[PDB]
Scaffold this active site. Structure first.
Site, PDB file in Angstrom:
ATOM      1  N   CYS A   1       8.116  16.078   4.223  1.00 44.96           N
ATOM      2  CA  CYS A   1       7.437  14.990   3.468  1.00 44.96           C
ATOM      3  C   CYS A   1       8.422  13.698   3.616  1.00 44.96           C
ATOM      4  CB  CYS A   1       7.337  15.271   1.826  1.00 44.96           C
ATOM      5  SG  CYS A   1       8.911  15.293   1.021  1.00 44.96           S
TER       6      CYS A   1
ATOM      7  N   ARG B   1      -1.745  -2.073  -1.811  1.00 45.41           N
ATOM      8  CA  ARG B   1      -2.715  -2.657  -2.368  1.00 45.41           C
ATOM      9  C   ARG B   1      -2.646  -3.123  -3.752  1.00 45.41           C
ATOM     10  NH1 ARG B   1      -8.568  -0.771  -4.027  1.00 45.41           N
ATOM     11  NH2 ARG B   1      -9.834  -2.038  -2.765  1.00 45.41           N
TER      12      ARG B   1
END
Lengths: 344, 344, 344, 344, 344
Positions: free
Chosen positions: D201, D283
């Site tokens: 990961c 975002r």
């Protein structure tokens, strides 16, 4: 009370076996430069080689040519016994009969090149050994796949009593402390160490039998060092670092097998096929019951380059560990590494 | 106070599980040659095999032909149960009905070939078992994916009480000491060991359940050896050396599964596709709720060569460990190897 | 009595060595966001860097351009020594001679960019070091493949006695507690740690010598932290998380080697071959006897992106561990992972 | 005295982290058949799901469609917060407004489908949470990458005091006992567990931070079980066996992420490209500072098949471990396996 | 004036050679179904087969078993000549000595199986031919790599004189109209056609000699059909459609070589290596100067499947072209395809 790996016997899994890839040499205090380091080592209790390397008794590795080229390099070669008794004695004579070109040559008391010869077990083996001693050989190797056998110890003792004054006797491959102690007691001048040392060797896959070479060398050295018997590590070598690991684990000499199989001095005619080169060789003498062959080469260049690379690796290791002699290198420590340190 | 792997319960991670590739057989003092080593071993408390190999009760592996061949090779076959009771009884009769060709043949008191059959749990299983006993079967494998169940234990006890004098009842797959002890208390004449023994088998992936086979064998033998109940190691075998490792871990017999699926004597028509050969076989009987089928073949030559190779590897292991008998091999010691020993 | 890995000496295998992939940083109670975390750290006892990254003293990595860029990025560069003393002094002068563009720039008292230079051992090394000190260097790396040597220690002491007031002397590569202690007693202002840290590096293959980097850092920091001497972790880095792991293991600064070889600021002409880009460089100075060169590049974009990615990873680690400073991160705890954690 | 892995601090390497591949479920005494096993589990201290699964708060996994389809399956879905507050409240209303077709549907006291909604930390997060509670939501998930933060605990306590009587509050991802204890003290009705659970990961590679999921679940359960707080394992799942391992390690519910990213019920338009199908999304809301996205899908079919496969794996594991309920499954033991058991 | 391919001689490049892949059989007005098509064809002027297939005289293709099977399949076999004369005569006798099983069997006047034998050129070839005639062979193939030689022509004439009344003398390999006309004038009862017919055969690579098989067949048939002499197409075949193309090109019979080398009926012991099956065969008689051996096998299933596939393809071609007989197929037309028609 119960064993974490299963069962109730804590000695069922006797030990954790370490191979060459499991350990590294820890750097130590050093006042040694690689060029001046003394690589000389005891092959037997009476024979000191200038280079601590010995070509193996394989039909693809050592013949009279390889034995001579190895003796001139400062090591020694062991003639394989997969050939007639007369032919092996003739190759012994070839090595014995044949200044600045070869300064490191290992020579007997007569100035003739030192050579070793392999023998099996049995009356045929006895007459072969007597022929080879008559032929002027210096080292007799009673070499077998599993030397912890009554027959092997009996042969070693018989040779040591009969021809022990002239020649030195070496016992075959062991992997445990008890086998090395038995060979020492039987009178072996050196003990060869290793049973299924390779990771995917035929002995491990087919028989499920093996012993990682580092632990085997450690145990055999624990058995042999008090009596002054040298230990020769045979098998499991892949790079020059493995020779340094074997010697630092306690062994006195390394035996080179597949690393020398395809060299120019190795037997066989050099042939050209499909843009590359190989060796061609255009049984009765295969009497070893536990040998790898019972259970189931590309050209490699001159011997000099291989020996130079291995010796340079050894000298670099001696510089890192601060060893002026092989005896001091045998006192070096190891660091064990995890699987994460093995990944390319 | 905390467990080094997490939590506060030291028994949450019960133990470390060893598989076949984790261990190797150490060499020992030996006076045994592979040729004269005796590979006879107990299948059950009453039945002895001259070769410690048994074919698995799988549809792709064992039918009448495979059972006959396995019995003639010195082992035994166990007929699968994925078929109507009439067909299985007919196959048992075919094996039973059918001297220098097969010296090692396993036989009963009447001289007929020994055979086994698998049964489940339930009423259909009970009538299947009774019909098979009438047909003349010698071993009833009460086989399940998880034999540590009250139903399986009760079935074993019922079969022992009903037909224990005629046939031998073998309890199905267990993987712990407690399950093997429960089967022994249920009266089983042998214990079959292995639950998700394969590394990436379906049981381990879909259900997350399994047990490494060496540790499972060690625990089951710890449960069974004091009572003389033999252990049949089932699953996880990849090489001939794995058979030796399983036997040395305490198993008396090894059940051959995936290694026998593609052989000639295995059921199925031999067809030719794309320059290769495969086997073809042109459910109401797969009633095990924990079976691998609920969670979701190439040709391999004659059975004789596979058996000969396996026995050669086993005999080599016995010669290396100094084991004249399988019982001596069961006392052999293991060396645990690191990850570096598994590198090709 | 016997060691479980072989022999009778418990110190023969000194310890188990952890590399970067063996450990992970555990999360902890945190009130630190990566943006406001402070990555300032000591390079030497007197010099502090705002970004704990240093370029290695390699010919393919660090010249005047790379040194200038590294100093402007918040770290420092160490000029290689595989070149005549005049060229190295000129490069030091070039770096020294050459406010909103570079806020993080490392500087000396005069405001010029901090720079370092590597020196060897010997008379040529001594005159090289004196000329570099005259040229205005700030750090002298007495760099060797094995700094646990009397010559290196004497050179460190001589440089500390001669130019210790002007420049900081950093001792070369060590891998044990004893070697780091020897360098600290020699007066070194920082200790560079790592000897064959790579998994399959040349030092481990040819010589069999090495030390896993996490354990080596731990031992060196155990030697150095009581005396306040910083540790520079050199070698073995593959990812940005390895920098965080090395810092948490106790290293104050990480030296960047193979990660910076192909970048734009690295020396060499950028050429285009076969649809890819490489670097070109169209020995009397490689005088280290244990150097990797004695035992025997693709383009990688701007240095700025590499530094930004490394610092982003480090800041993320500091935010995860609740470390406001590098000194706090050095107290973070590791979790050791098995082989299964390394599987892609 | 010195630590074998380096240094003098024995707590520097705090623990050995076990992942899913490191452990297997040991078979235990069983009277459980897979079909009748009770898979119901506590999602919170007040909410019991019929299926112990919860789709994750990812923009590629859970929207109103996925939440409804998950609630009808017997689990629940958590609406992601990467969308406007009004849109998330509208999807909450869509789930709330929308017999034999869905017998297992998890419904509130009014018969409306249960739905969960994710919230960040901050005043924007507070007004979002108040809007979602006004919209009829049932579970509020204060979800963050590293929930061992003062802000996260403050948000959890604020929600529990303000809207705790009506809704249940869940604390974000933890990996240690201390973080789980802090979440329990702050008033969380459930604790989500896992920080960098995947082997490769981005958190492990970039930040060097991670915790193997099995050990993390064990520690968090040790922290949360005495107070009756359920633990939800989130991440590191690759097969249905991993769900069983997570639940048997002590967790009460599993959170499905990438396993549901490409399903039909997952958001996105299904498109056909180059002979296959994928999902397209034609975002400000990404305010998580330690999120994976800051550090740097193929179509998967209907949700029903995936849920059926995972539940079948869970039921098979419950049968093997003899667990009639999830609570009994949480008492199952593990066996640790070596690297040799991982090789395909 | 100049030839567009170079020079001034328009006959230097004699013609454009078409191989099998260059042409396809065009469909025609047809009222023939494959099942009722007659595949009877001439092998020699006197001998008619039921299936126009003949096994080549190669030591890996045709021995007594292959010849017997081929004659029982409706064709005929030609025994190889690479062996002592007595052994070849014994093979002929074995074939001749060895009713619903083989309805298509080709027979002689006395009802025994038909067979052929290959002979060379010379005095030893003469005595071999005479002995074979005594043994009862029906066809003598005077086979050479290049039959447009005075020795081969004189051998054909001598055999047509001495034993022409009893056996049919088939002239060896030719590739032009002139050579076929020379064989016809010598008295050959059939002409074998093909010289370096394969694309990358040894004859084309080492010597640069060859002739595409379709054009060679067309030329040989132009030479032979006016005299009623059949043409045997020998070489270049890859698929069943190639047999139909060769027959339509004008050949009466196709000789099967490499396609039958690995079949069960071909000579050689069937062995198992590396999970596959191969064949094994555990020079003085290779006296042809231009033979392929002077310029420098996997198992293929039963012969019956190969014969059935070839005959099915041929029957499909006959049904497509409206050819009730092989002679009608010999009148079929071709469409030449471009390279674009070859692209997979």
């Amino acid at each position: 009370v119960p064993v974490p790996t299963g069962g109730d016997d804590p000695t069922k899994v006797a030990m954790l076996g370490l191979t060459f890839d499991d350990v590294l040499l820890l750097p130590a205090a050093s006042d040694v430069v690689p060029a001046t380091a003394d690589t000389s080592s005891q092959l037997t209790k009476r024979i000191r080689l200038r280079v601590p390397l010995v070509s193996s008794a394989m039909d693809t590795v050592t013949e009279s040519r390889m034995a001579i080229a190895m003796a001139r390099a400062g090591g020694m070669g062991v003639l394989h016994r997969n050939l007639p008794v007369a032919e092996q004695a003739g190759q012994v004579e070839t090595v014995k009969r044949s200044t600045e070109q070869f300064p490191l040559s290992t020579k007997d008391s007569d100035g003739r090149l030192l050579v070793g010869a392999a023998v099996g077990v049995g009356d045929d083996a006895w007459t072969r050994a007597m022929t080879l001693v008559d032929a002027g050989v210096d080292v007799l190797i009673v070499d077998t796949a599993h030397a912890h056998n009554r027959g092997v110890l009996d042969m070693v003792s018989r040779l040591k009593q009969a021809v022990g004054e002239r020649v030195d006797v070496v016992g075959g491959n062991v992997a445990t402390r008890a086998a090395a102690a038995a060979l020492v007691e039987a009178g072996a001048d050196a003990v060869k160490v290793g049973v299924g040392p390779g990771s995917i060797c035929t002995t491990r896959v087919v028989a499920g039998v093996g012993a990682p070479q580092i632990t085997a060398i450690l145990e055999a050295v624990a058995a042999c060092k008090p009596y002054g018997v040298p230990v020769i590590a045979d098998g499991g070598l892949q790079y020059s670092g493995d020779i340094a690991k074997a010697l630092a684990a306690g062994a006195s000499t390394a035996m080179l097998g597949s690393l020398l199989a395809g060299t120019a001095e190795s037997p066989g005619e050099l042939i050209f096929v499909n843009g590359k080169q190989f060796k061609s060789y255009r049984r009765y003498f295969q009497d070893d019951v536990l040998s790898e062959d019972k259970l189931v080469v590309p050209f490699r260049g001159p011997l000099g380059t291989v020996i130079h690379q291995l010796t340079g690796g050894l000298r670099a290791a001696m510089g890192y560990t601060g060893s002026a002699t092989i005896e001091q290198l045998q006192q070096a420590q190891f660091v064990q590494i995890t699987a994460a340190g093995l990944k390319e």
